[PDB]
């Protein structure tokens, strides 16, 4: 096979399991023969899942102050664009937070060493994280054999996807709204470098003029 | 995929055990000295990788990670010259009067009377008058401040440790197989397109967006602390349209093939810039653009994984 | 790291440590004693 | 144990319905240690019973008088007629020592369940303590225990858990708008679109400090914004 | 600009290179050229699962899209340089 | 099985759990020799022993200051006491080397020969300077409460409680210098500034700690 651009060579190992699979592999990065380092078939499927569900938080995160501002639910002072929040102080920074964005960045540093490195030592050592004392909260962190899908009693709160056959759908649907959303973050970023506006403003301006307001009539002729 | 990534996981244990035994690479040297010709043959046969082993794969892994060692030493060497360009120089003073102030970037320590080597190079400064011409690179790069030289010196130390990591990784942890190196079609498609082609595309983009508006303001005559910083030359298109009035047309004349409308800052002047004696920078900008389009085209010559392309 | 201390105890590494010792000693003496042409008191 | 907090959720192995109010919950693994589950049970009972006094304090102190505001009811200018401008240092001296007795006796009922049942002064009537957290005896002057005890032990928590959330509501419906709970009930039921959760989250009606007889207090709302 | 003199050239140069290699008038992934000029079958170096009947992959689209832009940009700026638009 | 500095990663082979404060933290394998690690166990203690004395010394003289007392700050206590009391400065430091260089070479020949210093070579004191183990002498003088004997199960607990307070005392005395070079004032002035406004009066808002101010 599906999703043209595939090949016979990237179809031997790439069978139909390992969900999100559609056979699209022109270059053949994931390949279980002779692999090593970060082009391992396990690290690449894992990093795709992680790149998916960070992007879809950002894809619903870059669009949300602008949509809720047009709907009037948030005040106009927080109706800023996603690059004008302090992520890029060259592009503009909101000055009304509860701290300097270097205070909040160090709170981000601490909270993401404790989040990401616990997240990494279950990739390396899969049975870990439910071994040493971590506030009694280590009973969550047993995970499973697969690193991208831990499924503890917190990360699978509502125990959704009970059977195996129902689980392959939701694992597919996560990547399907992930590979859309990774493209959406690329279609937020590159579309804001060129235009200089928000994503929802570019949605409104394309519904207003479909022809005279698109990629073509935006090179500032 | 005949052209594919192929490495071997952990060929060599990262261990200091073989540093204890000099001459470990060769049979003739590992039994210790009995003669001072041992320690000369140690340094002579050290990088003779073809003579250590017979395996061409083991030779190839040794010359691949040694090249990261040479690149890692060049990144130390470059980062020295930007650092000695930053903290011990007169590059601040040189840009204001680059006719009388002699370029100097080495300063010696006053101990045995060797401080007399700190000449009167001008610019309120004493030091060895250098001749390697880095200050002429840096005005061509539009550096204009010793902050920029310090940040790219720290960027040189970071890049050198990345290169030392890479030779360590691609030898000890994950070293390539032999048929990885024997894809000379894939190497030339990547080196003509990516290294030479995209390199001169990227440097032209540095010359369009940074060096041209900085050196136009230096030739028109502006003190270097008054020139806009080059990130302001990116975020504000209205500044660029003041110097070259065709940035107001955006990147529309490129895609509409109205390339003659870019004639302000991609030129074919030739000769020399009479204000500064050097080549015209807009001339060198259209140079590295047309160099890049040439090599990216030539970088799609050889056949790797689809039937198009030549086979050597 | 016992093998690493053997490397630190090879011939050129002790040579380049002891020569930084002996030059670095004579450099500090020739700083705090400027220009000793003749043995004073 | 059954009818859990969500339909398709498997209850954890340590929550087989022994304790009251057991709903197969804890999606944070905190009761996985058996010795920690007892202490979290004791601290749940404490957070339930103080909140049930807290809810029955706040919505009764404004029925008896809707004048003194419960957020600033601790200031000595707002204390009643025999206590107006009392020394708060003296009143804290009573409360600290009267509570360092009670709590440590309760704490030693946790640590040694059984060697704290007697009145230590008067070696007389004991307190028959059936299970930890439920002393009884003189804490049951009405004899409302000794029936279906499990039924009332669930009723104590379910009323208690709602009172915990209602008391954190009683605070956040007071820092956002500066108004009492039945008073914010009147503010909703007058105009239920301009006095909702919208346009009051993001404004803190509390100052940086209110001086008490020569002492400042940090006085922080539960979210930033003013 | 749509339908101008240059936009007609770029469509009639790209689609000419697409119609060449699809209809056997230019090499593809499936077929190369010999040491002479004859158009002969290839190894394809991966094997393709192109659903199209002619074996015309997206790699065939990108190549003759780059050549169609490659011919056409030289035609447009060659005609601006000689003066004929 | 034991708690390690970094969960997941196993402790190194040279570092089974018998030392006090052992958490497997030797990423550079500096204790890979079992006899230099006997020296660094001595070294972690006497660095922590002086830092526990130090960090209590900075804090207790800064508690007295800013209340209203006539105390100096710890960076200015050096000048103010060789000036108030007319104490000549080289003759103060030399006696510090005499008394402690006495007390240090006794340690330096406890490490070389643990049975030594207990031959009556001193004024008659024999088993007071016997030494119980590495970094823990004990005996009559160094443990006058007698806490290193009697119950040894609680003594292993006190060994860990010494190292735990000893680690973060070294971090404190690395932070007192860091709070002084960055800000330029006393330690409990930096605490009370952080308690005045916890936002914006942290390390991020100096311009000395992050250069991206
Ligand atoms: C001479 C240069 C060179 C060459 C030929 C290789 C070759 C290889 N490396 Mg290696 N590597 C290098 C330098 C090099 N490396 C350096 C300098 C480092 C240190 C950072 C590494 C670290 C490294 C790791 C950790 C791994 C490899 C891997 C690989 C293999 C596959 C690479 C691949 O498909 O990634 C394709 C490339 C990408 C997907 C891009 C990665 C993201 C980069 C950093 C951004 C693009 C950088 C760009 C060139 C310049 C900046 C652009 C920017 C300004 C926009 C292959 C054997 C992998 C492997 O198979 O193990 C052996 C692997 O796991 N390498
Ligand atoms: C461009 C400089 C350069 C580079 C990259 C290398 C690179 C290398 N040398 Mg080498 N060498 C050099 C100059 C250089 N040499 C010079 C000038 C001499 C004196 C003639 C030698 C003498 C020499 C000997 C005698 C030996 C090597 C060895 C090695 C290899 C071991 C790598 C290693 O341990 O790095 C890690 C070192 C670090 C400092 C890490 C960087 C941080 C590696 C290929 C060894 C070898 O190839 O054995 C198989 C070996 O035995 N070298
Ligand atoms: C377009 C991709 C690309 C690029 C940019 C390069 C770039 C380079 N290769 Mg190369 N290579 C490639 C693909 C690529 N290769 C492929 C596909 C193969 C397999 C057929 C090889 C096999 C190969 C060998 C066998 C050797 C090189 C070497 C080199 C270096 C030439 C040294 C020089 O002139 O300094 C130019 C220096 C720079 C431009 C500095 C920037 C360096 C960048 C950051 C690293 C190169 C990008 C890297 C390939 C992308 C992967 C990122 C990594 C994190 C995974 C240069 C870094 C030689 C070398 O130096 O070995 C280390 C060498 O011996 N290459
Ligand atoms: C790799 C090199 C490189 C990079 C990173 C950039 C990046 C950029 N260019 Mg640029 N440019 C480049 C090469 C490059 N260019 C070359 C080679 C030319 C000559 C054809 C131009 C001619 C050009 C113009 C005329 C303009 C840009 C503009 C821009 C900016 C916005 C691009 C946009 O609107 O979409 C962006 C920072 C626009 C702005 O820049 C400040 C703008 O007006 N560029
Ligand atoms: C409505 C909530 C509620 C409910 C259902 C219970 C229910 C129970 N409590 Mg409890 N309790 C509550 C609130 C509640 N309590 C509060 C707020 C406190 C703090 C003062 C306590 C303090 C407390 C102690 C210290 C003890 C109990 C005991 C008991 C048990 C028997 C007594 C009884 O039935 O009282 C029910 C009374 C009512 C429902 C009246 C509510 C009307 C209002 C004014 C039973 C499990 C005793 C026990 O289990 O002995 C073994 C025991 O020792 N409780
Ligand atoms: C999780 C999403 C989110 C986040 C991070 C914020 C973040 C913020 N909001 Mg906000 N808000 C949100 C959703 C969110 N809001 C929604 C859904 C509503 C409805 C509001 C209604 C709202 C109001 C009415 C106000 C804020 C304000 C604020 C700011 C201080 C508090 C802060 C920037 C305050 C501000 O300073 O502006 C303020 O007055 N928000
Ligand atoms: C069919 C339509 C058409 C038309 C009318 C033109 C018309 C023109 N083209 Mg053009 N072009 C076309 C199609 C067309 N082109 C196509 C399809 C391509 C893509 C391949 C190009 C690519 C192209 C380039 C790259 C250039 C032109 C240039 C020119 C202009 C002047 C040519 C000249 O005087 O060079 C006469 C030059 C010489 C006789 C000397 C050439 C020698 C070179 C410089 C170095 C030696 C190379 C090599 C060693 C020689 C032997 C190698 C051999 C085996 C290939 C002229 C207006 C030039 C231009 O715009 O200048 C303003 C220019 O640089 N064209
Ligand atoms: C005059 C100034 C110079 C004198 C220097 C001091 C000399 C003192 C000296 O010789 O010590 C006198 C002796 C010297 O040491 C004696 O020397 C003898 C000859 O070498 C033998 O070696 C004896 O074994 C040894 O005890 O020291 C003592 O024995 C001190 C014992 C202290 C006993 C205290 C009991 C502790 C219990 C009470 C605690 C409660
Ligand atoms: C005790 C309490 C309040 C007691 C209040 C009192 C006495 C108030 C008295 C006063 O007001 C009056 C009467 C009058 C005022 O003038 C004076 C004061 C003095 C102000 C509230 C606790 C309230 C306690 C609350 C709300 C606790 C909520 C905790 C929750 C929801 C956590 C759930 C979880 O942690 C678990 C349980 C398991 C995990 O697996 C899952 C998650 C979700 C993590
Ligand atoms: C590596 C990926 C390859 C592509 C290179 C991308 C490099 C990243 C550059 C980001 C810097 C911001 O670049 C871009 O910012 C502004 C937003 O459009 C543009 O600024 C322009 O747009 C604004 C709103 O449209 C207006 O103020 C003006 O039109 C003008 O200032 C700049 O002309 C451009 O430089
Ligand atoms: C994956 C795809 C990545 C992007 C592929 C490259 C983009 C497409 C190639 C450019 C196609 C033609 O490009 C061009 O056509 C448009 C006509 O509608 C022009 O649009 C504009 O042209 C003139 C401005 O210069 C104006 O007089 C026109 O009113 C306006 O339509 C754009 O300036 C330009 O983009």
PDB file of C-alpha atoms in Angstrom, chain A residues 15-141:
ATOM      1  CA  UNK A  15       5.056  -7.534   6.746  1.00  0.00           C
ATOM      2  CA  UNK A  16       1.825  -6.057   8.099  1.00  0.00           C
ATOM      3  CA  UNK A  17       2.463  -6.243  11.809  1.00  0.00           C
ATOM      4  CA  UNK A  18       4.292  -3.402  13.672  1.00  0.00           C
ATOM      5  CA  UNK A  19       1.279  -1.080  13.520  1.00  0.00           C
ATOM      6  CA  UNK A  20       1.234   2.012  11.449  1.00  0.00           C
ATOM      7  CA  UNK A  21       2.675  -0.282   8.790  1.00  0.00           C
ATOM      8  CA  UNK A  22       1.762   0.524   5.217  1.00  0.00           C
ATOM      9  CA  UNK A  23       4.898  -0.591   3.385  1.00  0.00           C
ATOM     10  CA  UNK A  24       6.020   2.938   2.523  1.00  0.00           C
ATOM     11  CA  UNK A  25       9.801   2.766   2.814  1.00  0.00           C
ATOM     12  CA  UNK A  26      11.681   4.139  -0.195  1.00  0.00           C
ATOM     13  CA  UNK A  27      15.020   4.339   1.594  1.00  0.00           C
ATOM     14  CA  UNK A  28      14.826   1.262   3.798  1.00  0.00           C
ATOM     15  CA  UNK A  29      15.951   2.697   7.126  1.00  0.00           C
ATOM     16  CA  UNK A  30      14.130   0.145   9.257  1.00  0.00           C
ATOM     17  CA  UNK A  31      15.814  -3.119   8.198  1.00  0.00           C
ATOM     18  CA  UNK A  32      16.531  -5.922  10.709  1.00  0.00           C
ATOM     19  CA  UNK A  33      19.585  -7.196   8.844  1.00  0.00           C
ATOM     20  CA  UNK A  34      22.963  -5.562   9.560  1.00  0.00           C
ATOM     21  CA  UNK A  35      21.367  -2.747  11.558  1.00  0.00           C
ATOM     22  CA  UNK A  36      22.725  -0.994  14.598  1.00  0.00           C
ATOM     23  CA  UNK A  37      22.765   2.218  16.504  1.00  0.00           C
ATOM     24  CA  UNK A  38      19.645   4.328  16.182  1.00  0.00           C
ATOM     25  CA  UNK A  39      18.592   2.811  12.855  1.00  0.00           C
ATOM     26  CA  UNK A  40      17.552  -0.261  14.832  1.00  0.00           C
ATOM     27  CA  UNK A  41      14.028  -1.431  13.883  1.00  0.00           C
ATOM     28  CA  UNK A  42      12.925  -1.088  17.495  1.00  0.00           C
ATOM     29  CA  UNK A  43      14.249   2.445  18.056  1.00  0.00           C
ATOM     30  CA  UNK A  44      12.710   3.799  14.862  1.00  0.00           C
ATOM     31  CA  UNK A  45       9.183   2.534  15.502  1.00  0.00           C
ATOM     32  CA  UNK A  46       9.546   3.805  19.045  1.00  0.00           C
ATOM     33  CA  UNK A  47      10.725   7.252  18.010  1.00  0.00           C
ATOM     34  CA  UNK A  48       7.952   7.500  15.423  1.00  0.00           C
ATOM     35  CA  UNK A  49       5.388   6.891  18.159  1.00  0.00           C
ATOM     36  CA  UNK A  50       7.094   9.486  20.357  1.00  0.00           C
ATOM     37  CA  UNK A  51       7.408  12.001  17.515  1.00  0.00           C
ATOM     38  CA  UNK A  52       3.723  11.318  16.777  1.00  0.00           C
ATOM     39  CA  UNK A  53       2.266  12.048  20.186  1.00  0.00           C
ATOM     40  CA  UNK A  54       4.429  15.019  20.944  1.00  0.00           C
ATOM     41  CA  UNK A  55       3.384  16.603  17.667  1.00  0.00           C
ATOM     42  CA  UNK A  56      -0.317  16.037  18.146  1.00  0.00           C
ATOM     43  CA  UNK A  57      -0.104  17.775  21.497  1.00  0.00           C
ATOM     44  CA  UNK A  58       1.535  20.630  19.644  1.00  0.00           C
ATOM     45  CA  UNK A  59      -0.861  20.324  16.717  1.00  0.00           C
ATOM     46  CA  UNK A  60      -3.760  20.834  19.096  1.00  0.00           C
ATOM     47  CA  UNK A  61      -1.509  23.230  21.003  1.00  0.00           C
ATOM     48  CA  UNK A  62      -0.557  25.719  18.322  1.00  0.00           C
ATOM     49  CA  UNK A  63      -4.143  25.952  17.105  1.00  0.00           C
ATOM     50  CA  UNK A  64      -5.932  26.176  20.469  1.00  0.00           C
ATOM     51  CA  UNK A  65      -5.175  29.766  21.660  1.00  0.00           C
ATOM     52  CA  UNK A  66      -6.251  31.054  18.279  1.00  0.00           C
ATOM     53  CA  UNK A  67      -9.444  28.998  17.949  1.00  0.00           C
ATOM     54  CA  UNK A  68     -10.582  29.654  21.522  1.00  0.00           C
ATOM     55  CA  UNK A  69      -9.746  33.325  21.025  1.00  0.00           C
ATOM     56  CA  UNK A  70     -11.937  33.596  17.944  1.00  0.00           C
ATOM     57  CA  UNK A  71     -14.697  31.864  19.912  1.00  0.00           C
ATOM     58  CA  UNK A  72     -14.252  34.414  22.700  1.00  0.00           C
ATOM     59  CA  UNK A  73     -13.766  31.858  25.465  1.00  0.00           C
ATOM     60  CA  UNK A  74     -10.285  33.102  26.417  1.00  0.00           C
ATOM     61  CA  UNK A  75      -9.473  36.836  26.674  1.00  0.00           C
ATOM     62  CA  UNK A  76      -7.726  38.667  23.880  1.00  0.00           C
ATOM     63  CA  UNK A  77      -4.510  38.993  25.881  1.00  0.00           C
ATOM     64  CA  UNK A  78      -3.894  35.239  25.555  1.00  0.00           C
ATOM     65  CA  UNK A  79      -4.949  35.098  21.880  1.00  0.00           C
ATOM     66  CA  UNK A  80      -1.311  35.124  20.753  1.00  0.00           C
ATOM     67  CA  UNK A  81       0.207  32.991  18.033  1.00  0.00           C
ATOM     68  CA  UNK A  82       2.201  29.904  18.886  1.00  0.00           C
ATOM     69  CA  UNK A  83       5.580  31.335  17.925  1.00  0.00           C
ATOM     70  CA  UNK A  84       4.781  34.518  19.883  1.00  0.00           C
ATOM     71  CA  UNK A  85       4.599  32.774  23.255  1.00  0.00           C
ATOM     72  CA  UNK A  86       8.224  32.882  24.395  1.00  0.00           C
ATOM     73  CA  UNK A  87       9.354  29.753  22.568  1.00  0.00           C
ATOM     74  CA  UNK A  88      11.055  32.181  20.149  1.00  0.00           C
ATOM     75  CA  UNK A  89      11.683  35.534  21.912  1.00  0.00           C
ATOM     76  CA  UNK A  90      12.926  36.928  18.576  1.00  0.00           C
ATOM     77  CA  UNK A  91       9.454  36.333  17.160  1.00  0.00           C
ATOM     78  CA  UNK A  92       7.796  37.863  20.231  1.00  0.00           C
ATOM     79  CA  UNK A  93       7.198  36.752  23.806  1.00  0.00           C
ATOM     80  CA  UNK A  94       4.213  36.947  26.115  1.00  0.00           C
ATOM     81  CA  UNK A  95       5.378  38.921  29.141  1.00  0.00           C
ATOM     82  CA  UNK A  96       2.506  38.119  31.487  1.00  0.00           C
ATOM     83  CA  UNK A  97       3.315  34.635  32.737  1.00  0.00           C
ATOM     84  CA  UNK A  98       3.853  33.799  36.386  1.00  0.00           C
ATOM     85  CA  UNK A  99       7.635  33.787  35.886  1.00  0.00           C
ATOM     86  CA  UNK A 100      10.468  34.640  33.549  1.00  0.00           C
ATOM     87  CA  UNK A 101      10.559  32.103  30.672  1.00  0.00           C
ATOM     88  CA  UNK A 102      13.987  31.072  31.976  1.00  0.00           C
ATOM     89  CA  UNK A 103      12.506  30.227  35.363  1.00  0.00           C
ATOM     90  CA  UNK A 104       9.815  28.173  33.643  1.00  0.00           C
ATOM     91  CA  UNK A 105      12.465  26.647  31.390  1.00  0.00           C
ATOM     92  CA  UNK A 106      14.392  25.323  34.374  1.00  0.00           C
ATOM     93  CA  UNK A 107      11.165  23.914  35.794  1.00  0.00           C
ATOM     94  CA  UNK A 108      10.853  22.346  32.355  1.00  0.00           C
ATOM     95  CA  UNK A 109      14.456  21.081  32.620  1.00  0.00           C
ATOM     96  CA  UNK A 110      13.901  19.331  35.956  1.00  0.00           C
ATOM     97  CA  UNK A 111      10.493  17.929  35.058  1.00  0.00           C
ATOM     98  CA  UNK A 112      11.788  16.581  31.736  1.00  0.00           C
ATOM     99  CA  UNK A 113      14.890  14.948  33.132  1.00  0.00           C
ATOM    100  CA  UNK A 114      12.597  13.024  35.487  1.00  0.00           C
ATOM    101  CA  UNK A 115      10.122  12.276  32.709  1.00  0.00           C
ATOM    102  CA  UNK A 116      12.329  11.479  29.739  1.00  0.00           C
ATOM    103  CA  UNK A 117      15.087   9.526  31.467  1.00  0.00           C
ATOM    104  CA  UNK A 118      12.591   7.309  33.247  1.00  0.00           C
ATOM    105  CA  UNK A 119      11.123   6.964  29.765  1.00  0.00           C
ATOM    106  CA  UNK A 120      14.517   5.935  28.380  1.00  0.00           C
ATOM    107  CA  UNK A 121      15.541   3.394  31.012  1.00  0.00           C
ATOM    108  CA  UNK A 122      12.451   1.363  30.186  1.00  0.00           C
ATOM    109  CA  UNK A 123      13.558   1.227  26.578  1.00  0.00           C
ATOM    110  CA  UNK A 124      16.993  -0.009  27.611  1.00  0.00           C
ATOM    111  CA  UNK A 125      16.013  -2.123  30.620  1.00  0.00           C
ATOM    112  CA  UNK A 126      12.391  -3.147  30.051  1.00  0.00           C
ATOM    113  CA  UNK A 127      11.636  -4.746  33.384  1.00  0.00           C
ATOM    114  CA  UNK A 128      12.932  -1.736  35.295  1.00  0.00           C
ATOM    115  CA  UNK A 129      11.143   1.369  36.667  1.00  0.00           C
ATOM    116  CA  UNK A 130       8.971  -0.783  38.925  1.00  0.00           C
ATOM    117  CA  UNK A 131      11.984  -1.783  40.966  1.00  0.00           C
ATOM    118  CA  UNK A 132      13.373   1.116  42.989  1.00  0.00           C
ATOM    119  CA  UNK A 133      11.340   3.211  45.371  1.00  0.00           C
ATOM    120  CA  UNK A 134       9.764   6.141  43.577  1.00  0.00           C
ATOM    121  CA  UNK A 135       7.073   7.264  46.059  1.00  0.00           C
ATOM    122  CA  UNK A 136       5.065   4.053  45.658  1.00  0.00           C
ATOM    123  CA  UNK A 137       4.362   5.299  42.108  1.00  0.00           C
ATOM    124  CA  UNK A 138       6.673   2.623  40.681  1.00  0.00           C
ATOM    125  CA  UNK A 139       3.716   0.212  40.579  1.00  0.00           C
ATOM    126  CA  UNK A 140       2.498   2.183  37.569  1.00  0.00           C
ATOM    127  CA  UNK A 141       5.814   2.046  35.841  1.00  0.00           C
TER     128      UNK A 141
END
